Amino acid sequence: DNSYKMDYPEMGLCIIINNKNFHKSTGMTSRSGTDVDAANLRETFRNLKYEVRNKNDLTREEIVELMRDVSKEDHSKRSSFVCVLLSHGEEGIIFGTNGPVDLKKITNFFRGDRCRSLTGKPKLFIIQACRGTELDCGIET
Amino acid sequence: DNSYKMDYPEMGLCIIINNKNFHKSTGMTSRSGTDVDAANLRETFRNLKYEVRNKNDLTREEIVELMRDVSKEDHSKRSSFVCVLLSHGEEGIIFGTNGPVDLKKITNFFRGDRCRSLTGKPKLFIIQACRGTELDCGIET
Amino acid sequence: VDVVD
Amino acid sequence: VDVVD
Amino acid sequence: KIPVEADFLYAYSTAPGYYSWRNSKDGSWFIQSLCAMLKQYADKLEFMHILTRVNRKVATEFESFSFDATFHAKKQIPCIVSMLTKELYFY
Amino acid sequence: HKIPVEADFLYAYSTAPGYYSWRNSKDGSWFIQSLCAMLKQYADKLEFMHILTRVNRKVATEFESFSFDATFHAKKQIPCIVSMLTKELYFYH
């Protein structure tokens, strides 16, 4: 079978975590323009027939809680799963409003053995976040 | 221009680094079966019209020297560049016969600004090596 | 302007 | 047998 | 069995180790581009090819504008990481 | 008009970040075995990312480790395609 089966009754969930405002504790700036991102994504995946859920300004613990809860639903009639993360980050790390969370902790909930109603189905993670402090100066073509 | 231009006079180089025997002081096993890989790769890319160069049991220093040397060639009449690395490894690391090499140091030689006759052309790195010590237990399905 | 996150 | 890299 | 890490795809906005860029008014370069490409190609292109068009859009059409010379005239490439085992067509 | 210095790279890793990669003593590594097989069969028919996706499915479905060591027995592997490419890649005309 060369193509994923995408004619289940539902395309799947599309979870959007939109972190804009961070705790003074963290010294990270507000992420202006991300509401534009979050609304664009909502509309785009609505048009693809995903059941979209937008979440704003979540702590690390709220992110972990949500992803665990979501991974424990019955995805049996869903074709796929999509998660979008819009935040600050470091390499392998996404920020809740109050601190860092390992991306591996988020995605492990959806592992083939840990979320059986998504076993064999595409699990898409879309990550808008930095991955370090390197700058690409580019090259003239 | 949705597709790379692959009708230059030459498909390009295919560099195969085949590390099988490591110095005993590294404590690292011999990689039985890698000669089968290296010969398979040589034939495969020969049939694709790549100029193949096979290399065996290179030290840490020989790998870096080979990589800068190759990146300093004139790739102007070549469509692409292919490097295959066959060794032990860790996350971000390929092993020479006498020690570890950061993969970023190898690939940095071919950056768009450091290898101008490959700017705009696909640079393919094929890496057969470990990336850590985790085991995938699989899921029955 | 553009900024980094 | 299979072995790891 | 299949691997427990199979059938994931991680569409990163930027390459390992690098900053990712966001326009203060229009949103991030990556998400802007991802949505435009999905809008225009989700009914005709496989997802990897859509994502490749995203890479080209980010790489060619965006360049940072900043009052801070440190952060001015910079570029960005997204990073597609696929552990997928099949092709993906949304239609 | 510039392009990123990291653009137009593809890294075809044999295994997922953090994981062992597997090699058969006699036949070679699962990944290279499958990569050569898929290039042989599809380099004149398919775009390279779709070839590498076929490689992912071959490694994931047709291989499972056989080891006298129970710790290392019956394990699986998924390759990891990392694309900073900006165009489609066809090895044929």
Report DSSP letters for B78-124, one per residue: EEEEEEEEES-EETTEEEETTEEEEHHHHHHTTSTTT-GGGTTS-EE
Name which of A67, A109, A88 is nearest A23 in CA terms.
Answer: A88
Q: Which residue has the tokens 């020989």?
A: B62
Strand partners, A78: A10
Q: Among D2, D4, D5, select the one facing F66 at the smallest CB separation.
A: D2
Chain F closest-CA separation from residue D3 CA (Å): 5
| Helix/strand/coil (H/E/C) assignment for every residue in B21-36 | CCCHHHCCCCCCCHHH
Q: Are A42 and A126 in contact (CB under 8 A)?
A: no
CB atoms within 10 A of CB F32: 25
Is A23 labeled as catalytic in the residue annotation?
A: no
Q: Are E14 and E88 in contact (CB under 8 A)?
A: no
Q: Are E85 and A123 in contact (CB under 8 A)?
A: no
Q: What are phi and psi of F55, to 5 degrees?
A: -60, -45
Q: Are E37 and E57 in contact (CB under 8 A)?
A: yes
**Spatial distance between the Cα atoms of A110 and A80, rounded to a whole number of angstroms:** 11
E8, A107: Cβ pair inside 8 Å? yes
Strand partners, A90: A93
3-state secondary structure of F69: coil
Handedness of CA A44, A46, A48, A50 (dihedral sign): positive
A112, B141: Cβ pair inside 8 Å? yes
Q: Which of A14, A75, A83, A88 is catalytic?
A: A88
| Helix/strand/coil (H/E/C) assignment for every residue in F26-64 | CCEEHHHHHHHHHHHHHCCCCCHHHHHHHHHHHHHHHCC
Chain D residue numbers touching B31 (CB-CB < 8 A): 5
Q: Terminus-to-terminus CA distance in chain F, angstroms?
A: 29
What does each C-alpha distance from E34 to A53, A77, B50, E73, F59 come to in angstroms?
A: 18, 26, 34, 22, 29
Is A137 labeled as catalytic in the residue annotation?
A: no
F8, B122: Cβ pair inside 8 Å? yes
**Spatial distance between the Cα atoms of A134 and A111, rounded to a whole number of angstroms:** 31
Chain B closest-CA separation from residue D1 CA (Å): 10
**What Å resolution does this PDB entry report?**
1.9
Q: Are strands B10-18 and B78-86 parallel, antiparallel or unpaired?
A: parallel
Alpha helices per DSSP H over chain A? 34-47, 60-71, 103-108
- Extract the tokens encoding A42: 């909502």
Q: Which residue has the tokens 């949505």?
A: E35
Q: Which residue has the tokens 């079966």?
A: B33
Task: Please calculate the CA angle B134-F52-F49 and round it to the nearest 5 degrees.
Answer: 125
Chain B residue numbers touching F89 (CB-CB < 8 A): 3-4, 6, 80, 122
Name which of B33, B87, B38 is nearest F27 in CA terms.
Answer: B33
Residue E21 burial (10 A CB sphere; 0-12, 13-18, 19+): buried
The contacts of residue A2 (CB under 8 Å, 6+ apart) are E86, E87, F54
Q: For residue A81, give the H/E element and its range.
A: strand A78-86
Q: Classify residue E65 by its DSSP letter.
A: -
Q: What are phi and psi of A113, to 5 degrees?
A: -90, -15
**Spatial distance between the Cα atoms of E46 and A16, rounded to a whole number of angstroms:** 23
Q: How many domains does chain A have?
A: 1
E49, F81: Cβ pair inside 8 Å? no
**Spatial distance between the Cα atoms of F75 and B135, rounded to a whole number of angstroms:** 7
Q: For residue B38, give the H/E element and its range.
A: helix B34-47
Q: Which residues of F54-87 are buried (b: 16+ CB within 10 A; e: fewer)?
A: bbbbbbbeebbbeeeeeebeebbbbbbbbbbbbb
Q: Among E3, E18, E59, select the one facing F78 at the smallest CB separation.
A: E3
- Extract the tokens encoding A40: 């664009």
**Spatial distance between the Cα atoms of B127 and B115, rounded to a whole number of angstroms:** 21
Name which of F17, F21, F20 is nearest F34 in CA terms.
Answer: F21
Q: Are A85 and A38 in contact (CB under 8 A)?
A: no
Q: Terminus-to-terminus CA distance in chain D, angstroms?
A: 13
F3 touches chain A (CB under 8 A): yes
Q: Are strands A123-128 and E8-12 parallel, antiparallel or unpaired?
A: parallel
- Extract the tokens encoding E43: 């009914």
Handedness of CA A92, A94, A100, A104 (dihedral sign): negative
Name which of B48, F5, F56, B132 is nearest E59 in CA terms.
Answer: F5
F53, E87: Cβ pair inside 8 Å? yes
Chain E closest-CA separation from residue B138 CA (Å): 4
F87, E52: Cβ pair inside 8 Å? yes
Name which of E4, E51, E10, E44 is nearest E30 in CA terms.
Answer: E51
**Spatial distance between the Cα atoms of A33 and E21, rounded to a whole number of angstroms:** 11
3-state secondary structure of F7: coil
Enclosing domain of residue B34: 1-141
The contacts of residue B30 (CB under 8 Å, 6+ apart) are B20, B21, B22
- Extract the tokens encoding F87: 């165009």
**Spatial distance between the Cα atoms of F35 and F77, rounded to a whole number of angstroms:** 14
Which amino acid is it at D4?
A: V
Q: Are F89 and F47 in contact (CB under 8 A)?
A: yes
